[PDB]
Design a protein around this ligand. Structure first.
Ligand SMILES: [Mg+2]
Ligand SMILES: [Mg+2]
Ligand SMILES: [Mg+2]
Ligand SMILES: [Mg+2]
Ligand SMILES: [Mg+2]
Ligand SMILES: [Mg+2]
Ligand SMILES: [Mg+2]
Ligand SMILES: [Mg+2]
Ligand SMILES: [Mg+2]
Ligand SMILES: [Mg+2]
Ligand SMILES: [Mg+2]
Ligand SMILES: [Mg+2]
Ligand SMILES: [Mg+2]
Ligand SMILES: [Mg+2]
Ligand SMILES: [Mg+2]
Ligand SMILES: [Mg+2]
Ligand SMILES: [Mg+2]
Ligand SMILES: [Mg+2]
Ligand code: NA
Lengths: 298, 158, 175
RNA sequence: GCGGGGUGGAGCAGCCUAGCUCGUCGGGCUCAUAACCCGAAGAUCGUCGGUUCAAAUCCGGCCCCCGCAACCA
RNA sequence: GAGUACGACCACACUUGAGUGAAAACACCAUAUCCCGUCCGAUUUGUGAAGUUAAGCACUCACAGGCUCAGUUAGUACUGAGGUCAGUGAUGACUCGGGAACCCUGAGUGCCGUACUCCU
RNA sequence: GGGCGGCAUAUCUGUUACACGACAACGCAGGUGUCCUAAGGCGAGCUCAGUGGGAACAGAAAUCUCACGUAGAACACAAGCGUAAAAGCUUGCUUGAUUAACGAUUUCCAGUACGAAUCGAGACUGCGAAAGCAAGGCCAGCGAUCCUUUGCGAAGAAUA
RNA sequence: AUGAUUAGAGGUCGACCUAUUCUCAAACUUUAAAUGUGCAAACAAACCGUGCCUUAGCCAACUGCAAGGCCGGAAAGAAAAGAAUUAGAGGCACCAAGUGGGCCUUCUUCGGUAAGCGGAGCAGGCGAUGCGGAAUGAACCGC
């Protein structure tokens, strides 16, 4: 026989972790350092750029930490990109850039500092140092840009990861998020340099266009077999040559009307679906009935 | 034999409570400490950086200095015939905002509210009467208080 | 019903091949090359956790080489190993976690051309069965526990072997 | 109380991660024994623990034996 | 009435079984040319959307184990102050005050924010 | 008593110690004069001790694999405390073990030094995508006057 | 939970598991007092007027936070609920003496078989102090 480890004494001495740690959502060691600022600042506002990627769409938020709970200043989602002309690929690197640019324009407009920080109107994947009060820069007296810090969460921070695509879009939108180009696609760990052309290709989905052409040719070689890859891409007449101009148009559309979202039906008592919790007396009555039934059989 | 190091005799003092282990939470990090505030100096054993000496654990003082990660607290300490104002340097995780003036602050705010209500024709709340005054008592049930034989047999074990 | 859900189909998660030479040196170097040819991928050496005077090993000494095979290559190798056993497995060869394994003594029994420089090696073939959805217990974010009903049991693994590979299960217990 | 030692059948090395000699056994040489020649076997390192991946070896406790102290009145 | 992202408190939230699950999500899932990383596209990374609620997830169930708050234990154990109190003593009671703990037993089984979304 | 012995002679952990702090004995149980270019710093991945099932030679114990596992392991050395997407393990890059304008403070305490610490300001940096984290290895591991000895006050500019 | 520990029971003998059970801890603890210990309880203070000035402080900025002031307002000068009391002049110095062998009791307490023995904590006392009592006694009772 094997000794039981999870005995009664095991549960008495157990100390559950934090709820978001048990659920595997929050890394509290990183969260503590991220919401920590100098005590000499006396709680002056500090913001996080939260980038979360699901299997379907991309979530980007501007968040300020509070004791009652984190408050969201502005949010942008990749499923609103169809309102600007991006119907497909709402998860790829190009969509990550557009989600970041959408959040930056939405945040700057809400703070009234739009048209004061235009960012980079035309993207080229080139890294520029971010103006922050931390660095001494040129000691320029010009107004500083809105500042947030990237919050990748539990995401693995590899080179070319989509979390840094949202970063690149946000900085190109006028927000000052401190960063180095080490994790942008096209950056070379050897010789410590960033290739802006490779980075620019991913921003406009050149890699997606090349793969779509490659998949289309393979599907053309054999019509019989059904290809799951790019199924909705090919159902529409999406051409690889039109992808770069579609994202360029979307960037211009985002910069013109950042507040535009998906159209709303705009129509109401809620229909309850919850199961009623049994009262204490009923649970006791049910248990009393069960023992009575067993007693009858004897 | 016995030694006198910095952390001598702190086996139970610098220890977490049962099932309450862990590093300080976000609300401690988000708490704002200002110069002139009242703070309780309670050492957090999971943060072995900037801990107060064991004497200052459980003492309440006034903040005199705020630094990026640290708090300067003035603490009274009796030595021989006088009490010295000792300034200790600790990390922010080892200070809690003191509620030692909560009752006094509420008393001041109640007076302002009462004064404003009295100033402009408002009905003051009724004054509480003392419970030590006399009065007639009507008992619903009356029982006899006595020592019984059962009391003596009930205190015998086995 | 619920058991007919296509997500409950039992698939081969991986096939792990282990050669515990236990001696290091040139003998282990040739065993790694044989595994490299067998599995068509670079294998990884294994060091010794402890030092055993009886076994003639020292701590942190490379005594074994192993490889993890997934997909089509694992299925092809599994058939090769099962041909040697003649598709006959003992009942006790199956774990209660839904996995099983067997050993072959001559690696040239798998149709591999003999090379005088390398020699002859036995190996351990281990198969891990499972269903789709086991990633929830291995992903970094929101890692949780797979449901109890979704686990592959010993009976299901034995049933899978008899049907997919037309094998025979001999009822016995280890001595 | 202080210091030091227990190792093949015996006497002693190695004591800072198993050896010698004698003895024993088999075969030669001799009429035979011894001496001599050729081979072989025999080792919980005093017991109990600990440190270490690994303790005859390093750190404690325990059992015998061995010495040096045990003074001033 | 629900979902997602970030959360505050950190089991009334955990653990073990069982059942149920609108919508939209979330998630399993498909794949490996590119960015990236591995013995292994398992994890991770990129690109996708053919399938599925089977798992995860959310609810509900158990005279469930834990946990939380009460009640009992109990004015008991202990204890501040007092006696030219008792007793050979060990100790004990008494007077003016304070006052536990486990077992056992009753009830309960998360709650509160910001933004967006479904129900609509 | 002294002697012999030992060291309670400087010093660290637990307990004595009586729930702030403080408290003796040649009281109890143990430590210290070292060790480390990493066993310092940082980032990222990972989870340990142990079980249970299974796999050629392989067995109580060699390696592989799946579950469980609140730490029952580890963190140089005594002990206590602390720590689980770490403070442990592996790995990659590094020299924050440098300098630091006589800043302030704690422990011992006479509120004197010494030794250890704590909170900073400046320079130059290391790691990190970033918030940040580091001027050694948290807390024991060490030294006055006088004397000796070493480093710093580079070169070049100034009619002073 | 960590150590110590007696006995049955339930899953040839035992071992091993499951439940509990006899007995414990200065160097064990989930829980946890009494007595304690830190701070506060309106006159250089605090509170109110997004009143005003200044800053090379913080914040992307600002009338927002930080700091130092100025100008005003209000102030049971701290109500009522048991809701303090005081033989309640606070602060600041200077110059110096004796002392640095202690001892005894109440509770707590370590070594020791124990001691009119050795060693501590809190507080009284003798020493330094007689007087009235316990016949007599440095310390007991009263004063
Ligand atoms: Mg991180
Ligand atoms: Mg204690
Ligand atoms: Mg404590
Ligand atoms: Mg499901
Ligand atoms: Mg289901
Ligand atoms: Mg005390
Ligand atoms: Mg104390
Ligand atoms: Mg390390
Ligand atoms: Mg880490
Ligand atoms: Mg010093
Ligand atoms: Mg040190
Ligand atoms: Mg350090
Ligand atoms: Mg370290
Ligand atoms: Mg150290
Ligand atoms: Mg340090
Ligand atoms: Mg205790
Ligand atoms: Mg008076
Ligand atoms: Mg004397
Ligand atoms: Na005298």
């Amino acid at each position: 026989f094997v000794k039981v480890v999870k005995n009664k004494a095991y549960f008495k001495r157990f100390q559950v972790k934090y709820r978001r740690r048990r659920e595997g959502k929050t890394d509290y060691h990183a969260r503590r350092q991220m919401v920590l600022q100098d005590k000499t600042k006396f709680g002056s506002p500090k913001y996080r750029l939260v980038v979360r990627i699901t299997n379907k769409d991309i979530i980007a938020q501007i968040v300020q930490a509070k004791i009652v709970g984190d408050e969201v200043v502005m949010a942008a989602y990749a499923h609103e990109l169809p309102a600007f002309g991006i119907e497909h690929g709402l998860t790829n690197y190009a969509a990550a850039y557009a989600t970041g640019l959408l959040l930056a324009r939405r945040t700057l407009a809400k703070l009234g500092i739009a048209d004061k920080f235009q960012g980079a109107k035309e993207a080229d994947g080139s890294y520029s140092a971010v103006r922050t009060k931390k660095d001494d820069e040129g000691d320029d007296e010009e107004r500083f840009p809105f500042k947030a810090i990237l919050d990748v969460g539990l995401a693995r921070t590899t080179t070319g990861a989509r979390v840094f695509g949202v970063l690149k879009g946000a900085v190109d939108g006028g927000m000052a998020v401190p960063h180095r180009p080490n994790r942008f696609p096209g950056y070379n760990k050897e010789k410590s340099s960033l290739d802006a052309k490779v980075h620019r290709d991913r921003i406009f989905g050149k890699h997606v266009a090349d793969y779509l052409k490659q998949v289309k040719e393979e599907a053309s070689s054999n019509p019989d077999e059904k290809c799951v890859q790019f199924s909705k891409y090919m159902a529409a007449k999406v051409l690889p040559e039109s992808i770069e101009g579609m994202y360029k148009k979307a960037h211009a559309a985002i910069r013109a009307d950042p507040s535009k979202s998906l159209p709303k039906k705009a129509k109401v008592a809620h229909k309850s679906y919850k199961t009623k919790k049994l009262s204490g007396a009923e649970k006791r009555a049910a248990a009393k009935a069960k023992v009575a039934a067993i007693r009858e059989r004897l | 034999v016995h030694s006198y190091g910095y952390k001598s005799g702190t086996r139970h003092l610098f220890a977490k409570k049962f099932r309450k282990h862990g590093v300080p939470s976000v609300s401690t990090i988000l708490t704002n400490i200002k110069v002139g505030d009242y703070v309780d100096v309670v050492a957090d054993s999971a943060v072995r950086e900037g801990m107060p000496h064991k004497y200052y654990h459980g003492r309440t003082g006034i903040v005199w200095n705020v630094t990026p990660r640290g708090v300067g607290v003035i603490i009274n300490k009796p030595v021989r015939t006088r009490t010295l104002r000792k300034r200790i340097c600790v990390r922010f995780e080892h200070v809690r905002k003191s509620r030692c003036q909560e009752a006094f602050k509420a008393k001041e705010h109640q007076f302002q509210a009462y004064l404003a209500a009295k100033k402009a024709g408002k009905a003051l709340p009724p004054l509480q009467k003392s419970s030590r005054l006399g009065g007639i008592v009507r008992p619903k049930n009356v029982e006899v208080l006595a020592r019984r034989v059962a009391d003596y047999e009930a205190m015998v074990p086995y | 019903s619920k058991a007919a859900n296509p997500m409950r189909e039992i698939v081969v998660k991986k096939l792990c091949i282990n050669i515990c030479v236990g001696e290091s040196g040139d003998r282990l170097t040739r065993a790694s090359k044989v595994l490299e040819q067998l599995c068509e991928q670079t294998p990884v050496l294994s060091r010794a956790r402890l030092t055993v005077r009886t076994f003639g090993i020292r701590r942190n000494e490379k005594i074994a080489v192993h490889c993890t095979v997934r997909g089509k290559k694992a299925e092809e190798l599994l058939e090769k190993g099962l041909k040697v056993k003649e598709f006959e497995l003992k009942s006790y060869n199956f774990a209660d976690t839904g996995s099983f394994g067997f050993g072959i003594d001559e690696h040239i029994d798998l149709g591999i051309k003999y090379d005088p420089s390398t020699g002859i090696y036995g190996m351990d073939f281990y198969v891990v069965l499972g269903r789709r959805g086991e990633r929830v217990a291995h992903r970094k974010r929101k890692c949780s526990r797979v449901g109890h009903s979704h686990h592959v049991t010993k009976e299901e693994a034995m049933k899978w072997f008899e049907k997919v590979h037309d094998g025979i299960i001999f009822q016995a217990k280890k001595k």
